[PDB]
Amino acid sequence: MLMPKEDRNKIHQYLFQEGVVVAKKDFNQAKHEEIDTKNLYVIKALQSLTSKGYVKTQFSWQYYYYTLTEEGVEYLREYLNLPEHIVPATYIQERN
Amino acid sequence: GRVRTKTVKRASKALIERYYPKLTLDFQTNKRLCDEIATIQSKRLRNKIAGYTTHLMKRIQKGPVRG
Amino acid sequence: GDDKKELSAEKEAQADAAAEIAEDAAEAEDALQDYLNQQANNQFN
Amino acid sequence: QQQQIIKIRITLTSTKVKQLENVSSNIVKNAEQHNLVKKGPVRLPTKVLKISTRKTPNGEGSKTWETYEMRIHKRYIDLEAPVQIVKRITQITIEPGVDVEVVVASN
Amino acid sequence: ALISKKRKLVADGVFYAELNEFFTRELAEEGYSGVEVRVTPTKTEVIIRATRTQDVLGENGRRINELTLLVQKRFKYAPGTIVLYAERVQDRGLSAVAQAESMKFKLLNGLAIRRAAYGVVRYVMESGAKGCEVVVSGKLRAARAKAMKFADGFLIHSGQPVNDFIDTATRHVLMRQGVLGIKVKIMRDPAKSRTGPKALPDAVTIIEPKEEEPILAPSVKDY
RNA sequence: ACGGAAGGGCACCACCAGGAGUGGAGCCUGCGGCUUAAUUUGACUCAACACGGGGAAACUCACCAGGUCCAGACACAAUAAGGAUUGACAGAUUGAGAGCUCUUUCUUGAUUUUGUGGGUGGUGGUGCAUGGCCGUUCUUAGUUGGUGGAGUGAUUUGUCUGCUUAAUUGCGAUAACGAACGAGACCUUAACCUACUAAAUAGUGGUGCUAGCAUUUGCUGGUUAUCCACUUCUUAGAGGGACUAUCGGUUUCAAGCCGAUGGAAGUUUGAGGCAAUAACAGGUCUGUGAUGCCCUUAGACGUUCUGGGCCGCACGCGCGCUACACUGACGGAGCCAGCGAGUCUAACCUUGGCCGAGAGGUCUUGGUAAUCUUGUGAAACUCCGUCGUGCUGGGGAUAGAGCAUUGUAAUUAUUGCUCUUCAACGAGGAAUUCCUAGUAAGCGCAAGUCAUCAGCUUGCGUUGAUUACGUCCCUGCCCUUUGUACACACC
Numbered sequence A: 001m002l003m004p005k006e007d008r009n010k011i012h013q014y015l016f017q018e019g020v021v022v023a024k025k026d027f028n029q030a031k032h033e034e035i036d037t038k039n040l041y042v043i044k045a046l047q048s049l050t051s052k053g054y055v056k057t058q059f060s061w062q063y064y065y066y067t068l069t070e071e072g073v074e075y076l077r078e079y080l081n082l083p084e085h086i087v088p089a090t091y092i093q094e095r096n
Numbered sequence B: 001g002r003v004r005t006k007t008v009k010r011a012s013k014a015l016i017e018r019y020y021p022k023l024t025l026d027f028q029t030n031k032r033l034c035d036e037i038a039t040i041q042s043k044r045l046r047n048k049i050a051g052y053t054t055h056l057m058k059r060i061q062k063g064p065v066r067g
Numbered sequence C: 001g002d003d004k005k006e007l008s009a010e011k012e013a014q015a016d017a018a019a020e021i022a023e024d025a026a027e028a029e030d031a032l033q034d035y036l037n038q039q040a041n042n043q044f045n
Numbered sequence D: 001q002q003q004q005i006i007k008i009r010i011t012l013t014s015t016k017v018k019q020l021e022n023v024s025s026n027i028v029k030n031a032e033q034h035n036l037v038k039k040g041p042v043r044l045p046t047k048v049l050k051i052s053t054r055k056t057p058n059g060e061g062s063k064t065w066e067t068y069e070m071r072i073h074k075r076y077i078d079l080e081a082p083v084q085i086v087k088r089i090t091q092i093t094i095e096p097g098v099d100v101e102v103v104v105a106s107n
Numbered sequence E: 001a002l003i004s005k006k007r008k009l010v011a012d013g014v015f016y017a018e019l020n021e022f023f024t025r026e027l028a029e030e031g032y033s034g035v036e037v038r039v040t041p042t043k044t045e046v047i048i049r050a051t052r053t054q055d056v057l058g059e060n061g062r063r064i065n066e067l068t069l070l071v072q073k074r075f076k077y078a079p080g081t082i083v084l085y086a087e088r089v090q091d092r093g094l095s096a097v098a099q100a101e102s103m104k105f106k107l108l109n110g111l112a113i114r115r116a117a118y119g120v121v122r123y124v125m126e127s128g129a130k131g132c133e134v135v136v137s138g139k140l141r142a143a144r145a146k147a148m149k150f151a152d153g154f155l156i157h158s159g160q161p162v163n164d165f166i167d168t169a170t171r172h173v174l175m176r177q178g179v180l181g182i183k184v185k186i187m188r189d190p191a192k193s194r195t196g197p198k199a200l201p202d203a204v205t206i207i208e209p210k211e212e213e214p215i216l217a218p219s220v221k222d223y
Numbered sequence F: 001a002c003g004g005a006a007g008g009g010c011a012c013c014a015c016c017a018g019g020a021g022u023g024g025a026g027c028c029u030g031c032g033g034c035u036u037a038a039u040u041u042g043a044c045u046c047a048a049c050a051c052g053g054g055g056a057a058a059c060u061c062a063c064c065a066g067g068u069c070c071a072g073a074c075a076c077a078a079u080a081a082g083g084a085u086u087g088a089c090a091g092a093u094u095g096a097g098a099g100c101u102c103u104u105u106c107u108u109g110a111u112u113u114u115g116u117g118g119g120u121g122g123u124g125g126u127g128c129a130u131g132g133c134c135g136u137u138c139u140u141a142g143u144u145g146g147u148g149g150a151g152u153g154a155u156u157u158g159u160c161u162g163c164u165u166a167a168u169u170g171c172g173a174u175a176a177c178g179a180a181c182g183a184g185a186c187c188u189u190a191a192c193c194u195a196c197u198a199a200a201u202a203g204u205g206g207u208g209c210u211a212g213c214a215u216u217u218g219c220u221g222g223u224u225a226u227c228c229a230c231u232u233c234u235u236a237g238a239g240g241g242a243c244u245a246u247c248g249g250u251u252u253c254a255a256g257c258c259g260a261u262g263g264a265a266g267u268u269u270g271a272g273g274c275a276a277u278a279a280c281a282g283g284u285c286u287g288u289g290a291u292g293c294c295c296u297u298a299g300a301c302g303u304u305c306u307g308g309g310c311c312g313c314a315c316g317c318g319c320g321c322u323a324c325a326c327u328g329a330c331g332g333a334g335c336c337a338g339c340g341a342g343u344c345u346a347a348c349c350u351u352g353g354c355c356g357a358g359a360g361g362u363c364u365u366g367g368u369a370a371u372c373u374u375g376u377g378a379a380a381c382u383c384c385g386u387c388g389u390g391c392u393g394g395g396g397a398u399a400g401a402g403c404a405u406u407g408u409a410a411u412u413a414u415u416g417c418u419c420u421u422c423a424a425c426g427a428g429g430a431a432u433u434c435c436u437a438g439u440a441a442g443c444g445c446a447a448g449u450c451a452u453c454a455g456c457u458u459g460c461g462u463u464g465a466u467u468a469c470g471u472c473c474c475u476g477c478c479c480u481u482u483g484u485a486c487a488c489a490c491c
């Protein structure tokens, strides 16, 4: 798609941080809850990210559920550059 | 109509068969009987049953009845 | 499936069920990465 | 050293009349089973959420109508207890299917 | 906050419906079989009735993270306030939904249409059901649509005990040709009911009298 | 399985005895037809036609006249940092304050672009490729296994002449005996509890404070807590109650049926919900991010934006509404329901006060609700008057002029009010629908839809009949008997 690196990272980064993204099917949503971009931006960004492995997508009642997968856990490691032994949804909280 | 089904009539037979001392011409007491002496899942069916294991009695008292 | 080969199905059906009882009785017992995310951007900040 | 009579109203709302009456009754004992003072379970008129629809996804056929319904049961129990018993009596007594709500105040 | 309780109780229904869905879509290869969501003090409790909870967990308990996180983000829960646990179902054999997904998954490794269903009925039986029925509908291999039935044991079909004693579930195994309809019916042995009616309403038991040894001219016992 | 053979049945989607009608009329609304840029489309006997919850001003929306966008994943290849690509102010242009496109010339920085492969979306096709759902047969009563009896066998007997029932419901007969699915049971609603447990969100009596009239103590009210009590009425928990009981006619003195008495209740107590096996090329790909295959994919069948269209009018068909009057209209006055709904991150249901003839407006207000709207003071209906049979003051079509509401927008007139205009229609040919008691019919109300719009529907209560309580004549179905060269089963 056509979107500036700024918005790509605000996605990409947030994906690595949370390890998870949800987002309602409604392009033209201006700003999406949480991430600071066009909703349309998120959906397609991820769609790409999935179509090359990396991430998994689920629908049901009008909402996308993107699950970051293990090979992606590497790809983001390249795109965000951060060193191996980084992070994801891969902590166990304090003692929760 | 009001033809009593087989379940009603089959139980009634089965009760008159093995409890003729005890039971009576009275449905009012035969009701209370059934409760103690028989497992039934509804009040309604129990009544439907007792009322007919009664009627059956009522005329045994004048002759026999096949079955 | 045709009824000419039926026996052969019902029996493989059983066997299928028999091995679904192997699974369900053998599962009735059988036998880090630190630094975080919003931290590495506050430690290299 | 605490404890003071704070005037309570526990409102009990559900679609499962067994679990509801259960949590209702078990509470009313666990009141005077330790001597409080109350006006007991007040059953509010159980109301019915009706929904009336054609069965058919489309148009064909004799026009058959089908009404689903959902029943909401609501009690309220008024208690007069101090802070200790109340908070105890709210966090426990919990039950999956019965929404418990405890207000306070004299207005 | 602040909602009508008519609106509130319906709302909670929907919430369950949307939640149950998402799981049935997300945990099929995990024998998802249902949920219940307990509203409590300080947390919202979600329990996943999946047969195979080892997968719902994951590497040091990952997945339920993603799963909560998902469920979290979506309905807007404030981290901590929503909590998921998985919980292996006590015999999948008496749970309609669990068996359709078996049936589905059977036919997707290409089991013979019967060997599939004909197996499930047999395993369900040995799980101690009172009766069980599977239908397959739609089209295999030929062009014109057929449908089969696969029953054994005992079922009833009408009135309240239906609400009481039979689990039913339709699934849609999406095949290369068109789509199959799987449709399972399990009828639980009402003897075991544990909480409810103990029998069918037709059940009329008579206690078996007593072998009297009567006669005997009066007499009385003192004490 | 079928027959344009025979014998039995069953039913107000049959008739009888009637009711109230439709068919005639005005209009409303769907369908055909015509018409058209387009008048999007599915469905055509009961089982297509106030049906797709289909009451379309935009949206919906598919159709028509026009304008943008890619939201064309991903892989290789090409291009290319000396710049792959992106965007634009003004002007021209355009319906448009769309940088669509052009002039001009800044900007952006590897996100794209060109190409092929591969995807993708689609209310595009196929319901005669499917799932699921539904409707139909079915207001029907049918389906099956155990042990036995018959047959080499598929199979049959059980599952049957009769009688009975709403029912393969039973009785009875009996090479069958005994059972299960479906029926019944069950479940929900409406009826009965001065028995039980309670209630300032239900209400009664007493007592205070208090108004009015009588005064002779009284009668009729005010007072979300001034206190005491109570649960009859209201509410919903747990119980109880009915089993066609008692008695009697009847009958194979069987199932049963009829009558009387009692009973809250005696038509399956009344009305529903659920409902076996099987069938249909029933309907729905236009509910679905359900789906195969085909089609299409950048001058798109994607999508969005502007504007028209689904309402267009020689006419055929179907559901409706209002009527033709005097059991009436009109005008004052009486004045009584039940099922409901209702506003959070928001404008829902609206009391009350004022202004306005009205519609409405404006100021405030209670309600997330047995708490407020609401006692929903609804309508038929009841009362006393006016009119007097005259197309009349019945009837209100058509139409002109004004004022208000919803909405970004009301013109092809959304709706509402006022004046005015004042049509057909004088009870409707052949035909045809619906119905058996709190039913028919009359009568309004909530709810769905809904910004606005019900002449529709789903429920509701109010007023409350006439005539059956039967039969096979009509019509439709079922059952045996029987014929078959049909079994893809008379398409």
Ligand SMILES: [Mg+2]
Binding pocket: E156, E158
């Ligand atoms: Mg049954």
Ligand SMILES: [Mg+2]
Binding pocket: E158, E159
């Ligand atoms: Mg039934």
Ligand SMILES: [Mg+2]
Binding pocket: none
């Ligand atoms: Mg007649």
Ligand SMILES: [Mg+2]
Binding pocket: none
């Ligand atoms: Mg007539």
Ligand SMILES: [Mg+2]
Binding pocket: none
């Ligand atoms: Mg348009």
Ligand SMILES: [Mg+2]
Binding pocket: F072
């Ligand atoms: Mg391409």
Ligand SMILES: [Mg+2]
Binding pocket: none
């Ligand atoms: Mg191509």
Ligand SMILES: [Mg+2]
Binding pocket: none
């Ligand atoms: Mg589609």
Ligand SMILES: [Mg+2]
Binding pocket: F127, F281
């Ligand atoms: Mg079809």
Ligand SMILES: [Mg+2]
Binding pocket: none
């Ligand atoms: Mg179909």
Ligand SMILES: [Mg+2]
Binding pocket: none
């Ligand atoms: Mg067609």
Ligand SMILES: [Mg+2]
Binding pocket: none
């Ligand atoms: Mg009838």
Ligand SMILES: [Mg+2]
Binding pocket: none
């Ligand atoms: Mg033999």
Ligand SMILES: [Mg+2]
Binding pocket: F159
């Ligand atoms: Mg026969």
Ligand SMILES: [Mg+2]
Binding pocket: none
């Ligand atoms: Mg009472």
Ligand SMILES: [Mg+2]
Binding pocket: none
């Ligand atoms: Mg009487």
